[PDB]
Amino acid sequence: LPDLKIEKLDEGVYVHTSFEEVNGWGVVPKHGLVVLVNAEAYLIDTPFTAKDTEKLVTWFVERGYKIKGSISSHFHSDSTGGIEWLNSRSIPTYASELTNELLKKDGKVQATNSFSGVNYWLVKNKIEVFYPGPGHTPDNVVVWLPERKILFGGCFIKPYGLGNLGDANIEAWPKSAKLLKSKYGKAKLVVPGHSEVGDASLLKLTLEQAVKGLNE
Ligand SMILES: [Zn+2]
Ligand SMILES: [Zn+2]
């Protein structure tokens, strides 16, 4: 029910926030990014719905920023819900091979472009994809913007509680978070999927929460 939000975070970097009512959770916000590269837009995660995906795309297109592509950080609908709509508009969609395998298992439309293995450049030296290992989901990836030092952690970054454990790997999450913290300690900003933007301390807080959740 709250409207899509689009807010500038940094030069060429915007945070989009969409909202869903989730049974037992109440209203759940979902953050992704729009990243501008030579005045074209890349969507980092789609909103939950085709409606908010269209609103997001239109906001940029009507301002002269063509959509070059989207990438989805994991198979959950809060990262993937707009894939069908983007595909229908011939906008390239990206997801890991494993994310696409889990979408297909969940009866969902797949991204048209897949990648495997651990580091992938969506845009050489500008938008990097990294797989830290299983945590929130088996397939969760993070997106790094090296020129800005901004990490989109997505639903893997859980600084105050692990959220929905439905598809989580509570055994692997601590090792995965330790690796992410080691690689991205230099981050200026970490953008979580469900919590507000913070600094690199969110990598430590996620590790602390994963360690705490394995204990039970
Ligand atoms: Zn999720
Ligand atoms: Zn999520």
Author numbering: 4 to 219
Authors' own words:
IMP-type metallo-β-lactamases confer resistance to carbapenems and a broad spectrum of β-lactam antibiotics. IMP-6 and IMP-1 differ by only a point mutation: Ser262 in IMP-1 and Gly262 in IMP-6. The overall structures of IMP-6 and IMP-1 are similar.
Here, we report the crystal structures of IMP-6 and IMP-1 with the same space group and similar cell constants at resolutions of 1.70 and 1.94 Å, respectively. The kcat/Km values of IMP-1 for imipenem and meropenem are nearly identical; however, for IMP-6, the kcat/Km for meropenem is 7-fold that for imipenem. However, the loop region (residues 60–66), which participates in substrate binding, is more flexible in IMP-6 than in IMP-1. This difference in flexibility determines the substrate specificity of IMP-type metallo-β-lactamases for imipenem and meropenem. The amino acid at position 262 alters the mobility of His263; this affects the flexibility of the loop via a hydrogen bond with Pro68, which plays the role of a hinge in IMP-type metallo-β-lactamases. The substitution of Pro68 with a glycine elicited an increase in the Km of IMP-6 for imipenem, whereas the affinity for meropenem remained unchanged.
